[model samples]
Target: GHHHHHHGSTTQRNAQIAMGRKKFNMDPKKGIQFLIENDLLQSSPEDVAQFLYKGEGLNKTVIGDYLGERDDFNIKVLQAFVELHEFADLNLVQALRQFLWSFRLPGEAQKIDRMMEAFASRYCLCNPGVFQSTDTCYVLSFAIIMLNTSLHNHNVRDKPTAERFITMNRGINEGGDLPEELLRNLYESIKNEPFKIPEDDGNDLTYTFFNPDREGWLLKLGGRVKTWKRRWFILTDNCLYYFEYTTDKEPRGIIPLENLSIREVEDPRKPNCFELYNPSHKGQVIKACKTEADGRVVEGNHVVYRISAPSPEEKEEWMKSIKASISRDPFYDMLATRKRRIA
Candidate 1:
């Protein structure tokens, strides 16, 4: 087959192949140190700077902002590690999963362990002293979203005064003196980019929120072909499956609802309508994180799935459930082992 057996690349591998792809640029934990040290940040995990979404690669800069770097929460970096595609109804995060999203405003006030870990690492960017991890981490996550509401949303003409900022953040802290400096750090940056859900929705996310079974028929726009196809879609188990007919025994394809976001847009030529955005490309955005296989980020075509419903009313119905099912941090996926003990 070859000329020799003890091959050291014959020391001639790179000699003739420097023109193929490029060089081998290389290199790449558990608990509260074992459970989420990776969730918070790893490696220099200790040192680093500005990012474009490097999974658990968040450095200490955003963890504790200093003049050397402009403040960035690395919300993007967190997206890659969020495990939204793991898919299931289990974890200690599972029962809490079924409950957290169902809880109105009160349950978030309770002390949660990993939520505590996540908060201590990042939410401390705000008033860590006054805010207890129990209520604070959860509330802080909510506040960050609502806070970005008016700021990142340009053209609203009537931006809410920062008064609401205090409302959203300090609510669980029992309405204490809001962290003025903390408010500005996030405020200034969010405005630089449009207030997007995948970003804010990601701020303080959980690995729960998997699925709430739903199924029906909808007209799907095929990727690439721009072809119109009526497909039956069954939604659940962190997947949105399509078929040629409602009675089909096997799905034609599965759109793993990972790293996808649902949004309702008005006045569709196709009547009731909504879109599933995958960011499908890479760079600096959050819808860009859903993935499967190898834990490596998944990229693809069809940045947006322009779908339509038969009736205007039905569109809203499907929109609501789709949003409920696939909205990033929701219950898209969090458990792959331990099947829930169903009664």
Candidate 2:
């Protein structure tokens, strides 16, 4: 049977969970003494050091530096400042109505100017979805680079500075903290509503694994490679697809022996076994297999590659078709439309 005794106060109980100090060694009266002896009520700005007195109990106020790094002071300050605005809670329709009621007629030049200024300022404090993704950081960094068309402002911008900000922002976001620079940049980018197009469609057999959003799949050649035969290959890593196709009347299980070098896979029945390196980033295709010995199945994979080989004609056709199909699809079209923001 477990024996237990009640801790007299809430603070004592919390202290037990935190410090794990033994009941006999703990000074139960320590906290009360600190509160009483310190005269916290009469504490002056310079006398703040007095509170740092080492006491008998755990110091609940002392926090770690990591926490501050996570919630960069700028973000916390901005959030507190923005939330103080009276109209913060209003929906878009209500906000618009309130704005219109406060403004003079559209013909009034002063009111229009005031309204535009107000709108711009208010929008600047709004969330711009900056820390949305790694791609977003890159895009914003690129835009920030492009906007400074002149040499003067461009000189002010540096990759190291931008990278530091990105890293700080990433830490705050990924580490359950907030970065003020991210918030400010997010707000600025959103308010300005800079129109942009991605350097490339990030979606691919390779990068999709890294896509935080769960939208990714590979579309292999269906015509040259039989639809069912191609379907046999399984996507392993984002860059690697494995398995084999067959010309059999009824395709059998993945043709283990047929898993070929990029050259051989492209034209399986042909002798062109060296045309696999033409593309800038041609994938290295290797075989994956399992051998059973003593009733235990162990994987035995082999590398089938060329140091450098011309890209197979079939691969070019396959890539072209796949790209064409994706380009035509509406799903990709939607993603192609990046967020439009204005400041």
Candidate 3:
């Protein structure tokens, strides 16, 4: 009886399912029209205008002002920009698409929404009492940060080992209680998907996250508090960056390598530690020392970075790599020729 409609309306009795399909670079106004023409977003034109068109607040093509502030909401927005900078005047859904998938727009995908919620769940593992549990805007940004370090770190020979994945998640999660099984499940899911690092990035690309020579969690000594705080450190070619969280793209501090030497020292209160200090800047800064002349009179007299690793072997390994990294020249051929020679 329920199947009777227009005498040939058996289609009404059966359930129907349709696949839902899910471009960045262009003008904010023109880009809006293009997306509408292609039927890309599930939003009104006004919504895109409000978030993207540069009339007032949070509407720039960039998010520069709050880039340094950790807990600031806009800093979250900027992480998407870091991940998808080529895209013009970003809105939530499109920005999410970059790390949210390996090109999410090609066809129907149900896991897209679910994985976003899962990202929110992982975010809340540390950020408890967040009133909105699965707000997708924040979810997008948080997901972007995780994608950066996980995919770009060159130290991983293949996909990161299970402990490497879990521990880095721990570095971001920040609180005592952890979801052990959930952590493993999340790690297992992302293991095969290198979001940014290609299986083989060609020789053409450099300067981005592709060149992080070494990166992981390290306990760094504090200058003001004298306590070793757990921080995430990334050693890019000539620069070292530490972030407040592994999920934070902004650097808490950046130490440039030049003439500085890293060597093992039994200095810190913790085991498996090493130190970096400059013997002299090699006359890098004579003016600063002239006015405040202490007896030693060196540019970097107070610059000592004490880093402690999780194990004895890693401690020396970091020391060995860092000690050797500063001596290489920026000269192009020496590297190519040496690599060719080694090969």
Full-model lDDT for every candidate: 0.43, 0.31, 0.45
lDDT by residue for model 3 (10-48), tens: 453231111111022323334444544545432543443
Which scores better on TM-score, 1 or 2? 1
What ranking emerges by lDDT with the best candidate at the front? 3, 1, 2
TM-score of each: 0.32, 0.20, 0.33
**lDDT per residue (tens digit) for residues 1-343 in model 2:** 9999985767855554344323212442343234434343123322222222221233321211111122344233223322333445432223333332221222232322333333324533443442444333323332332332211122333322334444533333323434555445543442344222122232211112111111112233322223322233222112223333423232221213232323334444433223222233345333333323344533332233221113455344434433343234332322223222211
Q: How many angstroms is residue 210 displaced in model 2 relative to the true structure, after the best TM-score fit?
A: 12
Error at 295, model 2, angstroms: 8.6
Off by over 4 Å in 1: 1-211, 266-268, 279-300, 327-337, 340-343
* Model 2 accuracy (lDDT, Cα): 0.31
Backbone clash total, candidate 2? 8
Ordered by TM-score, highest first, the candidates read: 3, 1, 2
> Which segments of model 2 are wrong by more than 4 Å?
1-74, 77-231, 236-296, 305-314, 317-343
